[PDB]
Design a protein around this ligand. Sequence first.
Ligand code: V9G
Lengths: 621, 103, 52, 151, 748
Amino acid sequence: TDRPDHIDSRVWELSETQEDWITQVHGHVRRVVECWKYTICCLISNMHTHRGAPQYDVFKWQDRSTIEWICSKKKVQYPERDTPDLYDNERAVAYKVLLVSDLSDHSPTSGIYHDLAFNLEGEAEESCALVLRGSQLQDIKGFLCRALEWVVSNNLTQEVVETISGEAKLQFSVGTTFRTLLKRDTDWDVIPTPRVEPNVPRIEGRRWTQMKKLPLLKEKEGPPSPWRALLLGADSEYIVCPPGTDQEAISWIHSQSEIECIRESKSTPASVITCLTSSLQSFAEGNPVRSRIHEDIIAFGINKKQEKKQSASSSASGEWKRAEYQVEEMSLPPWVEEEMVLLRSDQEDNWIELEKNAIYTEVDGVAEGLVDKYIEIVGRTKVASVIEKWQIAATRTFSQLHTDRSRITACPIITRDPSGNCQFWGMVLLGPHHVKRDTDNAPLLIAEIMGEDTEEKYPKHSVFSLKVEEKQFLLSLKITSFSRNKLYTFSNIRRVLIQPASIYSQVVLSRAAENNSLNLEVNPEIQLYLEGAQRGMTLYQWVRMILCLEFLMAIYNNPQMEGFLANMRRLHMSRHAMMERRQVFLPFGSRPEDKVNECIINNPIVAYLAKGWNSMPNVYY
Amino acid sequence: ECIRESKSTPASVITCLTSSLQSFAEGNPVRSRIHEDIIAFGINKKQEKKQSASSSASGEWKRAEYQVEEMSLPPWVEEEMVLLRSDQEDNWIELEKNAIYTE
Amino acid sequence: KVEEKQFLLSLKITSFSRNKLYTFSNIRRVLIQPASIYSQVVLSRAAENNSL
Amino acid sequence: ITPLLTNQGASPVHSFSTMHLDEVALRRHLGLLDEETLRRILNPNNPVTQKGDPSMFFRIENKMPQIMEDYSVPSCFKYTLSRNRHKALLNKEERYQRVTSIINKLFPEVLIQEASAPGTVRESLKRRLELVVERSDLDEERKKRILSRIF
Amino acid sequence: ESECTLRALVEEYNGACKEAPKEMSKQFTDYNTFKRYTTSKKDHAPQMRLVYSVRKPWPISMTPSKEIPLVFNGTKLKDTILDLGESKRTRANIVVPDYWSKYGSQTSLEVVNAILYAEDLKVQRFFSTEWGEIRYGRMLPFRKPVQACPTIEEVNPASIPHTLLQVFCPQYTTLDSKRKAHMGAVEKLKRVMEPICKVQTQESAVHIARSLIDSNKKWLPTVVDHTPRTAEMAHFLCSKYHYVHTNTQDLSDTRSIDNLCGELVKRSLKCRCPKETLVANLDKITIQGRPMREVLADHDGELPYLGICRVAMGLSTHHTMKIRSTKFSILNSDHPRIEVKKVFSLSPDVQVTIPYRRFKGKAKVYFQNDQIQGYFSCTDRQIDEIKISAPKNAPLLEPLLDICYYGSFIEPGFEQTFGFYPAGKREFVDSFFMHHSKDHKAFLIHMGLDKDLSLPLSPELNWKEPALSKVCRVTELDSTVQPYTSATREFVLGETLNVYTQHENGLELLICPTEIRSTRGPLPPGTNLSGSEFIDIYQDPFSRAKSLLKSTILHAERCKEFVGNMLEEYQDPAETTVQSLVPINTWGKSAKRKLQEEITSDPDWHQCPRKRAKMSYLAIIAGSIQDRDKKQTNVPRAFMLRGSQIEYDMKATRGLVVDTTNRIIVGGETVLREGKGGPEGYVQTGVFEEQPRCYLVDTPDHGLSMGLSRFCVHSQGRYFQYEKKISIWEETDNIKATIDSQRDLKRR
RNA sequence: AGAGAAAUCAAG
RNA sequence: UUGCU
RNA sequence: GCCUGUUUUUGCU
RNA sequence: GCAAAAACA
RNA sequence: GCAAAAACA
Ligand SMILES: *O[C]1[C]([C]OP([O])(=O)OP([O])(=O)OP([O])(=O)O[C][C]2O[C](N3=[C]N([C])C4=C3N=C([N])[N]C4=O)[C]([O])[C]2[O])O[C](N2[C]=NC3=C2N=[C]N=C3[N])[C]1O[C]
């Protein structure tokens, strides 16, 4: 522990309760120095006998009663303030061990004892050298030199010299004016000494109340929330194109396409469609970056901040007031349930093609079997296709944002099937961007293929009819502003598959551990509150729409969603406790539902989760 | 100290020998195992080889078709044949004499 | 190095069956084959003169 | 150019039970990576990962336990990625880096324990340099003309 | 050659002096601070730039070279046109490493082997463990610290810096650093890193060396009695739903060290104040070249005797109370386990006592045995509650009976007698276990029966087994329960070598000798019990005589004490050794007489080692087992040891002791080398910042061998001039004598 | 426009 | 210049 | 832009 | 010791 | 590694 290596364990133990080291300057160093002196005393009195008894008797670190008991028999007496360290019976002289930093200038001390002065290098004073034997000198020099080596190894030379000299600076001291500065904002001194008797009073407190029924999360009222996301989701579709590169696919599409406006929104003027076509042209000859056109100003909001500032200044009137921002509250839209019902239908392709890990052991075999089962139960699903589309679009748009450009960049969304045919999900146009931070927005124009058009779901989307090889498709073409951090996050959106895989693997492995054998084909009947009533349901489709809802929450993650999910865990735990006949008690002013209700403003999936929570029973018998 | 190192006999096995020379010097002809003994006697070598082969298995089963390599006459045979004849100061053979009763 | 004397120590890892070790434990029998010849040669000289 | 490595598009070599195993060693053990390419990817003199300054090396049971020469990171796939292009304090810290590097080269023992040499940095490294040159087993004239040029 | 390295160092020093006039006028110790200034190595977020960085036109930054062609087949490799010559300036494509994987200069095979050595160890270690069968059982985790990776040697942390310094920089070390290092680890590390240091830099080589000889324990959830004693394959052998049954021996010397410690404890308890005796002996016994204190600090095991010896040296222990197969740990208690000195006297005058232990107050004790684990809460001697987690249909006889014995809850066997008067503690405890094995109704009458069928414990002690009635107050474990201690426990070694744990209201017994059961085992290799007072531990007569002769020859005071105690029939700490070395004979009085002539003729005999050898030989013969019947005869010139063909000679011309004019060899080892390497060690004797007027040896080794009376070593700019030791005694002995005299004077 | 949510981006 | 299911 | 504390995973000195 | 990454409060 | 017809390790 704190014992130096050269100090003997017995000496260290004996020195613990000899002086109050905490109040002394450099208490540890002082204790080490006292141990040095005691070890020197031990080395002086080493196996030396005169009349069958030890020649030297050591008075250091011994009880004072016995010291006086043996001091009377020697016809001597010493005061309490300074007692000699040892005494020589053969010569009958009291000796005190001293350590000094310079033997050249040393002077005697009080005549009650003689000083055995030693240097930090093991040297001894001339008289001290002549009194002791050569073996004692060598042993003392060796011990002191080992101590010096320990000191220089630990860089403690200054402290050791200070303790030897005895100046003993307090190692810290607060001056006069600094104390006045410190005591400005407090009613106590530097060391507070209140004049009150320590006591804990009795305070009349409130009563803890049982939560007999679970709280009911309030549902906001207002217009249904529009689809506020970067991409379409379940309405996303693609166009089949002959196998080849992205440039070849875009050239094939552009040369064989007809665009006709069928629904125009005020948020996204239809006149910007030319922009997209221009980008197609630019990307047809392998130029993903094109010069600006007029409609780009409308499309990407070029110089919009300055125009809005001038308009505000022209229309400015009244008196300055605080900000007082307002967030519009919107109700749960009908399209969330349709999104849940969709996005789950089976697909022809697997849409999850992950290279299989190596298999060496049976543990590896069962792990890869479980992963393969999960992939084949959630692979052929619209969620996987939409996840692939989102990841491809996010990566393609992110890769074009680590620079400053005043031109228009095209980021096509193209995937490929096992057969090799291209699949056109849409294109992303990145406008003039000069990013200084990772959180600022950049303009984007998102053209993508719909499957079905809803006015109440896409109010800011201008839907176009696209004719390609006697085939009809719909086009979204929305104007948006999106950030670098969000794009990077959605570039790794494939990680959302872990949580439903976690549920599936936990169920399967729990069943395996219960039966002490792995089945790998279990599809048990999970009991769930479906329509306010508890019904059974297969595990595979449970994992399927768990993945659906996880993806829906991942793309709709905002402060409201973060707060709602963070505060819903307490209510989830309370419900789980009450279904096991456990009572829940709450403090006086306890309203756990308020911290959840404050986060329910306009997020459609937060409202969907709130409705799901309200649907299930609140009272458990 | 090692002069010549061979991949078939790693140097570390000397730690085994010095572990035995000391142990036998203490009245313990049999000693406990040490780490250097692991690669000294093929301990767990069958499992090592089988697991490595299973992990690196590829292709399809074919006949064993074992072969032995043909190797020429070593240059050291004549030195062996002439060095076993070196004269020695001792008899090196101690066989108890039998009794004699007839000629 | 033993008493300022040089030696070479050869270490080999091998593995042998109990049959081979037992067979080599009685290796002294190899002395039988040559002696026969010598013995015969001696008897040959006896067959030359009936005087061993 | 066959991939032969995970970052080169080869089939994964890491399994669930081989999370802790290095890729190169595991591929060598399984035979997926022959010695012909091993002697190339693990070259300590490859230009890809060659350090810009000479580095110091220990020598166990050698007459000169300190050998300084050019070095490269063994794996050629441990390269660095180029970056696009308290100000004077950064230059001061670069000077501190230079002093730390020369101290580490001349005082290997502080590489394992705390620094406790007496005196200033200049005098301490001067004495250590004189001592190490004195123990270089070179002849006398070499030593004198080496210590002649020490500032 | 070495000349280029010196040129490089001189030029670097000159550049540092010139480019940085400051930053070097500071003290050298200031390196401990300004080494931490490593800014400009900071980047915002490399994970958010990798995709873009790889796809830049010239992503890779490298130093200029001619090995990479400017333009390869079709493609252009390096951008060596813009500013060639500015250090790490050249820019190359992402395919350049791929181009180097082929069509590149190769390297010798030993270099490749050296680079991959550390990882190849892990690879073969994984492909060497036998992969068992997966067993699924819904495991209940036990969170404990386990070692991250296996080590080639076990070295205590305090000795880590000195060991590495002995491997890489012997020339900058002192003899104290040499003694504090683990020389076996030093040799292993030198052999391992001889090729490694040729391909790894200084700091890298130090890193691999420390990683090979450091523990670096980390907290993980493992499974009871299935821990792989290393976290290397924890992700593979256990996943909270299964384990892989793996087989592995101890592969360690911990058991041998336990055997040595047990022998020392057993032999120490037979003398006055066993604690001081054991502490003194442990400070003088060494294993290989390492002192016993440091090897105890190295092996921090779970074993009782090892824990006793570690506590005797001021170290801690991880031993836990264990009754046969069940381990117990007190989670919390109001008062320690109070001992009861219950007497079962066989007669009014003849009495036999069997002390036991119990709880006074409320206590809660976790227990585990095999896969069964849980806790029990009790008050005094009445059991209050039991929580158990165990596999279904498991037999819970032995864990419950171990709980009963631990708490003395059941009293057909506590506070009263079984029947016929017990012979002793061993027989009484064995009778208790054998009686209660076939009679578990005491448990049932202790905690009654319950009419509720949800209780999982059956009356016949089977977990979750249907029955008519169920045992009350024994239920399934609700939540995970595990013993954890927050404050670092400090252990007290009381008399009879009892290791107590410091509880708040008293002392908690942890380890108690006289009921620890362990058969005699092999001693650790290289054990040197020639220190003092314990030589009969050696079973071999060879080593048993060798240690005694090394003790007598190398120490004049020990030889004098041995002769004095062996001549006048005094108490000799090695009487048993002398009796067991010499067979029954009639040479006692003759040898004693010879001792008389050789002490009277030359009273100054105890300085010539030859005279010491002759006197020790005569003394060993003198106190042998004298035959009762046969008459005394003259002492033979040489004799034979018991049960061996080892010949011991007077003149030491042959056999166990050979004393040539140049050197004395005892048992095949040169104990004395005349002229160089005196018997006594060295003392440091001076620390200087300037070259002393002595000989500066290269390393601590190549010193202590020339036998010089004055030699200096270098360490961090300081010089240490070891000279010689002339004092016959030792600092530890001096301190012990002074403290003993002080305590005796206090008592008297 | 838009992104967005308690105040910003929408370049010089 | 552009290709993750 | 990017605090403090704890823990964890890498790599470099 | 340094640099990066992550989680938690 | 030992063998010599895949054995032992
Ligand atoms: O913080 C940290 C510490 C901790 O760790 P441990 O475990 O304790 O161990 P050690 O190291 O031994 O400790 P100390 O004594 O305190 O220290 C020592 C010395 O030496 C040095 N080093 C070390 N190492 C290991 C190293 C070094 N250097 C280099 N370059 N490399 C290496 O490796 C130091 O600095 C000191 O002075 O400790 C330390 N550490 C750890 N680890 C590490 C460190 N450092 C650095 N590096 C590393 N890697 C720290 O502090 C300082």
